[PDB]
Amino acid sequence: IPDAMIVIDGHGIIQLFSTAAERLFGWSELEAIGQNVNILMPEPDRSRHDSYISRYRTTSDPHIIGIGAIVTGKRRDGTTFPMHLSIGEMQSGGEPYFTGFVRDLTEHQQTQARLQELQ
Ligand code: HEM
Protein backbone atom coordinates (compact mmCIF):
# COMPACT_ATOMS: atom_id res chain seq x y z
CA ILE A 1 0.00 0.00 0.00
CA PRO A 2 1.91 3.06 -1.40
CA ASP A 3 2.48 6.26 0.58
CA ALA A 4 3.72 9.70 -0.42
CA MET A 5 7.28 8.93 -1.47
CA ILE A 6 9.94 11.32 -2.70
CA VAL A 7 13.46 10.71 -4.04
CA ILE A 8 16.17 13.38 -3.92
CA ASP A 9 19.85 13.52 -4.84
CA GLY A 10 22.68 14.38 -2.47
CA HIS A 11 21.95 18.06 -3.06
CA GLY A 12 18.29 17.90 -2.08
CA ILE A 13 17.02 18.03 -5.65
CA ILE A 14 13.85 16.04 -6.25
CA GLN A 15 14.28 13.21 -8.78
CA LEU A 16 11.05 11.28 -8.38
CA PHE A 17 7.73 12.40 -6.91
CA SER A 18 5.07 9.74 -6.40
CA THR A 19 1.45 10.13 -7.47
CA ALA A 20 0.43 10.07 -3.81
CA ALA A 21 3.04 12.73 -3.09
CA GLU A 22 1.30 14.88 -5.69
CA ARG A 23 -2.03 14.57 -3.88
CA LEU A 24 -0.52 15.38 -0.52
CA PHE A 25 1.71 18.33 -1.42
CA GLY A 26 -0.28 19.75 -4.32
CA TRP A 27 2.68 19.71 -6.71
CA SER A 28 2.62 17.63 -9.88
CA GLU A 29 5.60 15.47 -10.92
CA LEU A 30 6.89 17.90 -13.51
CA GLU A 31 6.61 20.82 -11.16
CA ALA A 32 8.40 19.11 -8.26
CA ILE A 33 11.16 17.08 -9.92
CA GLY A 34 13.79 19.73 -10.67
CA GLN A 35 13.06 21.60 -7.42
CA ASN A 36 14.82 21.49 -4.04
CA VAL A 37 13.00 19.34 -1.53
CA ASN A 38 12.94 22.38 0.74
CA ILE A 39 9.92 23.67 -1.17
CA LEU A 40 7.86 21.11 0.78
CA MET A 41 8.49 22.66 4.21
CA PRO A 42 8.02 26.04 5.93
CA GLU A 43 10.78 28.15 7.47
CA PRO A 44 13.12 27.71 9.36
CA ASP A 45 13.63 24.14 8.12
CA ARG A 46 13.32 25.29 4.50
CA SER A 47 16.46 27.47 4.52
CA ARG A 48 18.34 25.05 6.74
CA HIS A 49 17.52 21.85 4.86
CA ASP A 50 20.65 21.87 2.66
CA SER A 51 22.81 22.19 5.79
CA TYR A 52 20.95 19.23 7.30
CA ILE A 53 21.83 17.04 4.30
CA SER A 54 25.34 18.52 4.15
CA ARG A 55 25.90 18.00 7.86
CA TYR A 56 24.92 14.35 7.52
CA ARG A 57 27.06 13.69 4.46
CA THR A 58 30.14 14.93 6.29
CA THR A 59 29.45 13.62 9.80
CA SER A 60 27.73 10.46 8.59
CA ASP A 61 25.64 10.80 11.76
CA PRO A 62 21.84 10.52 11.23
CA HIS A 63 19.09 12.38 13.06
CA ILE A 64 16.13 11.03 11.09
CA ILE A 65 17.47 8.24 8.89
CA GLY A 66 16.82 4.90 10.57
CA ILE A 67 14.99 6.82 13.29
CA GLY A 68 12.03 8.63 11.80
CA ALA A 69 10.48 11.89 12.99
CA ILE A 70 7.23 13.85 13.00
CA VAL A 71 7.50 17.26 11.34
CA THR A 72 5.63 20.07 9.62
CA GLY A 73 5.17 19.91 5.88
CA LYS A 74 3.98 22.65 3.55
CA ARG A 75 1.59 22.31 0.61
CA ARG A 76 1.70 24.34 -2.56
CA ASP A 77 -1.44 26.18 -1.45
CA GLY A 78 0.63 27.43 1.47
CA THR A 79 -1.06 25.38 4.19
CA THR A 80 1.10 23.46 6.66
CA PHE A 81 0.44 20.07 8.24
CA PRO A 82 1.96 17.48 10.61
CA MET A 83 3.56 14.47 9.00
CA HIS A 84 5.74 11.55 9.89
CA LEU A 85 8.92 11.20 7.84
CA SER A 86 11.13 8.17 7.25
CA ILE A 87 14.34 8.41 5.26
CA GLY A 88 16.12 5.64 3.42
CA GLU A 89 19.57 5.99 1.94
CA MET A 90 20.54 4.59 -1.44
CA GLN A 91 23.33 4.70 -3.96
CA SER A 92 23.07 5.21 -7.70
CA GLY A 93 25.71 6.16 -10.23
CA GLY A 94 28.27 6.47 -7.46
CA GLU A 95 26.30 9.35 -5.95
CA PRO A 96 24.04 9.24 -2.89
CA TYR A 97 20.27 9.49 -3.21
CA PHE A 98 17.71 9.68 -0.44
CA THR A 99 14.20 8.25 -0.30
CA GLY A 100 11.56 9.91 1.83
CA PHE A 101 8.28 8.37 2.92
CA VAL A 102 5.65 10.78 4.15
CA ARG A 103 2.65 9.90 6.29
CA ASP A 104 0.03 12.62 6.71
CA LEU A 105 -0.99 13.01 10.35
CA THR A 106 -3.51 15.82 9.91
CA GLU A 107 -6.51 13.71 10.90
CA HIS A 108 -4.60 12.27 13.86
CA GLN A 109 -3.76 15.77 15.01
CA GLN A 110 -7.36 16.92 14.59
CA THR A 111 -8.89 13.98 16.44
CA GLN A 112 -6.41 14.33 19.30
CA ALA A 113 -7.17 18.06 19.34
CA ARG A 114 -10.92 17.53 19.25
CA LEU A 115 -10.83 14.96 22.04
CA GLN A 116 -8.67 17.43 23.93
CA GLU A 117 -11.14 20.32 23.74
CA LEU A 118 -14.23 18.18 24.40
CA GLN A 119 -12.77 17.86 27.89
C1 HEM B 1 8.73 17.76 3.73
C2 HEM B 1 9.05 18.08 5.21
C3 HEM B 1 10.48 17.86 5.73
C4 HEM B 1 10.97 18.41 6.85
C5 HEM B 1 10.31 19.34 7.85
C6 HEM B 1 12.31 17.93 7.00
C7 HEM B 1 13.10 18.28 8.10
C8 HEM B 1 14.38 17.86 8.33
C9 HEM B 1 15.14 18.20 9.52
C10 HEM B 1 14.59 19.06 10.64
C11 HEM B 1 16.37 17.58 9.36
C12 HEM B 1 17.61 17.56 10.27
C13 HEM B 1 17.47 18.12 11.69
C14 HEM B 1 18.26 17.49 12.65
O15 HEM B 1 19.46 17.97 12.77
O16 HEM B 1 17.86 16.53 13.33
C17 HEM B 1 16.31 16.90 8.11
C18 HEM B 1 17.35 16.14 7.58
C19 HEM B 1 17.31 15.44 6.39
N20 HEM B 1 16.25 15.38 5.55
FE21 HEM B 1 14.50 16.28 5.75
N22 HEM B 1 12.71 17.12 5.97
C23 HEM B 1 11.59 17.03 5.18
C24 HEM B 1 11.55 16.24 4.03
C25 HEM B 1 12.58 15.48 3.54
C26 HEM B 1 12.47 14.66 2.36
C27 HEM B 1 11.18 14.54 1.55
C28 HEM B 1 13.70 14.07 2.21
C29 HEM B 1 14.24 13.08 1.14
C30 HEM B 1 13.19 12.40 0.21
C31 HEM B 1 14.53 14.54 3.29
C32 HEM B 1 15.85 14.16 3.48
C33 HEM B 1 16.66 14.54 4.54
C34 HEM B 1 18.04 14.08 4.72
C35 HEM B 1 18.75 13.16 3.77
C36 HEM B 1 18.43 14.64 5.88
C37 HEM B 1 19.75 14.53 6.65
C38 HEM B 1 19.96 13.04 7.23
C39 HEM B 1 19.68 12.87 8.61
O40 HEM B 1 19.96 13.75 9.47
O41 HEM B 1 19.15 11.77 9.01
N42 HEM B 1 13.85 15.39 4.11
N43 HEM B 1 15.09 17.06 7.48
Resolution number, Å: 2.1
Question: If you measure from the C-alpha of residue 115 to the centroid of ligand 1, how many angstroms do you get, rounded to a whole number?
Answer: 30
d(CA 31, CA 14) in angstroms, rounded, equals 10
d(CA 14, CA 102) in angstroms, rounded, equals 14
Q: Which among 8, 25, 63 is the best mutation to test ligand 1's pocket, defined by most ligand atoms within 8 Å of the CB?
A: 63
* Structural biology method used: X-ray
> Is residue 37 lining ligand 1, measured as CB closer than 6 Å?
yes
Domains in the chain (CATH in brackets) are: 1-119 (3.30.450.20)
